[PDB]
Write a protein that binds this ligand. Structure first.
Ligand SMILES: C[C@H](N)C(=O)N[C@H](CCC(=O)O)C(N)=O
Ligand SMILES: [Zn+2]
Length: 214
């Protein structure tokens, strides 16, 4: 584990302007918006702040394990990089694994996590190395006591073709939607410092299990 390289992507920006509506190539024949604002709890806790703070806790834990780390943005209050640039930044580190952190907006009764991965793969590394990452992450999150999303995906997994950050990956990568910000239970956990710590520890368990060959 020590000496491996992991890049962490806290989804969305600290702030936005109309540049986020410019279209960028999506890695699968199309284009999509440079960025989106992301969602928020009904209490007003923004997705971009949840992902930022959770990624900071993941980074701190990985560094203590001897893992070399980088992030795709440096703050939670200004314009951040477009989704295609974030994939380029991740790729430039030649990482062993990449984890993108998001939180979702779904029906209010729906809760739990889902692990998004590229499907069908557009290159070799998006095949078995990435599907294994997705399954291992899902297993680790569930073994940590988190609930697979009750409202989307299949047992906490979601293979998809529409995400530029996944299509553009040159290294094993998953995008973890940790929960539904519009749900009472997930909102409480996301808004809780110790809830963010528990999310972060479970993600780290998934990273360790994947890099260890579990
Ligand atoms: C994952 C989320 N539902 C989403 O669509 N995010 C969106 C697109 C990310 C991508 O295509 O890589 C975003 N701008 O963060
Ligand atoms: Zn998001």
């Amino acid at each position: 584990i020590a000496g491996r390289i992991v890049v962490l992507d806290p989804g969305h920006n600290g702030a936005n302007d109309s540049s986020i509506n410019n279209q960028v190539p999506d890695g699968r024949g199309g284009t999509k918006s440079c960025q989106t604002s992301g969602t928020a709890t009904d209490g007003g806790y923004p997705e971009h702040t949840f992902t930022w703070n959770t990624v900071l806790l993941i980074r701190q834990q990985l560094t203590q394990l001897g893992v070399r780390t980088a992030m795709t943005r440096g703050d939670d209050n200004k314009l951040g990089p477009c989704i295609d640039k974030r994939a380029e930044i991740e790729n430039s580190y030649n990482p062993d694994a990449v984890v993108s952190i998001h939180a979702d907006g779904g029906p209010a009764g729906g809760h739990g996590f889902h692990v998004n991965y590229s499907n069908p793969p557009v290159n070799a590394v998006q095949g078995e190395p990435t599907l294994r990452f997705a399954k291992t992450m899902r297993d680790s999150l569930q073994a940590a006591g988190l609930t697979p999303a009750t409202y989307i995906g299949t047992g906490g997994l979601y293979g998809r073709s529409d995400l530029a950050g996944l299509n553009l990956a040159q290294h094993p990568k998953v995008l973890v939607e940790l929960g539904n910000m519009k749900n009472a239970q997930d909102s409480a956990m996301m808004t809780s410092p110790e809830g963010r710590s528990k999310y972060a520890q479970a993600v780290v368990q998934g990273i360790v299990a994947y890099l260890s060959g579990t």
